[PDB]
Amino acid sequence: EPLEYYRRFLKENCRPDGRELGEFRTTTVNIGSISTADGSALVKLGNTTVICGVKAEFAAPSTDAPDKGYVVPNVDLPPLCSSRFRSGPPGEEAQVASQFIADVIENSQIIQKEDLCISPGKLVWVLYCDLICLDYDGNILDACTFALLAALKNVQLPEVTINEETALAEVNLKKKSYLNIRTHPVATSFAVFDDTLLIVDPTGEEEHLATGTLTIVMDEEGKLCCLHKPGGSGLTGAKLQDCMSRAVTRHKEVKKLMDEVIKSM
Template sequence: MAAGFKTAEPLEYHRSFLKENCRPDGRELGDFRTTTLNIGSISTADGSALVKVGNTTIICGIKAELANPTVEAPGKGYIVPNVDLPPLCSSRFRPGPPSEQAQAASQFIADVIESSEVIQTEELCIDRAKLCWVLYCDIMCLDYDGNLLDACIIALLAALKNTTLPEVTVGTETSEPQVNIEKRKGLRIHKHPVAASFCVFDDSILVVDPTAEEESLCSAQLTVVTDEEERLCSVHKPGGTSLSGEKLQECIRRATGRQREIQKLVHKVTQSVKTAE
């Protein structure tokens, strides 16, 4: 009976739970799903991380390459994120060029990298106007069940903290770069941005960390990114019904709590790997 109701009237099925301040998966409205993190699992990458938020699974691999700085920013390196949503992660995605959702996610992450200043790109410059590091951040979804952006940001942050770069010197006579792969050092992480995503039902009911089904049924979505200083790095709202100032403040408050929780998790996993080494 319940299965039939869910199939025939999925929104009403969800509303029957929301009225009781709970959700079909047993969570309360403000509960995040269990989040797990592993780092350094891709041996061929300069840094990597695997994140699970509920059933949503994201892997991020970072590859550093030497390049010429851009003319506009001769004293900076740069970071290039790319989100891939292959058909294997969900039947909603098709083979071919990147989907609109994948492109939007890549742009969102690029904006967060810039606005949060997680890394000072000046520190990626080796020789002004001549040589710099480019960090290619390939983020792939292995299993999609909603809340893509939160999982991508956690995976990126953890992978950056796991990244080490070889020592590079520029020959005075030849001006050629000399790479010492035996001597590596980690990146300096200046900020720890963390995203928290929300769905709105019936213009007033907020649920955090939505599943794919909740995302498909809600009237609006919102993602808030904050750092450890409770600074607002980004607010992303792709259309839908408007939110009151009071609801927005509630989202920001929940996002700052989520930031502290995830930063602790990333620190704990990073330290345990360092201790094991």
């Protein structure tokens, strides 16, 4: 009798865990935990957990845009996250989340691909940002985006040069350079029950027994990068402006967190 058991708390303006329908859970990060990788970031929202490792490589660009350094995300929801996943190729949720991360990377414009061209037409960086879920207690997109941003700030790259005599490029793994990022997109999730009840940061069950879900990415300068609204019982702008406000608040909070962290290093 789960749904009924849950409406009882909902009408008491609470949840069975101790959250006041509009607040998230303990959010934490860890930067630079990993050496084998260029950038590393661990994020965890109480029980939910995510880890991003971003590697850097060389590659030849296309012909439509030689001055574009690729940024390739891939999400991995291995069976150790939850039992709803099985050993094998990626399912549907992993692929959707991957496309979401990519759409974000491309629309928020946190990074200029042009800032990754060494020798146009010949070389350009490729940033393989590999995200991995480890506990799918719910709201994995927020964690994925936040960990991506964190690691993508941690990443500092080397400097390369070209020699015309050898016609080849050399790297200098001693000197390096951080990676400039302009926008700081944060994602805020929502679960819409029957008609009008929007809960924030929904965990697993709350998403299992929900009529719809929503996610909203809110850049710092009062703008939006994505409004992911896959199905649902419906919404009017009045039940949406409130979500946007709360998203701005969450932006502020997590940006303060990330600043404190990058400054505590």
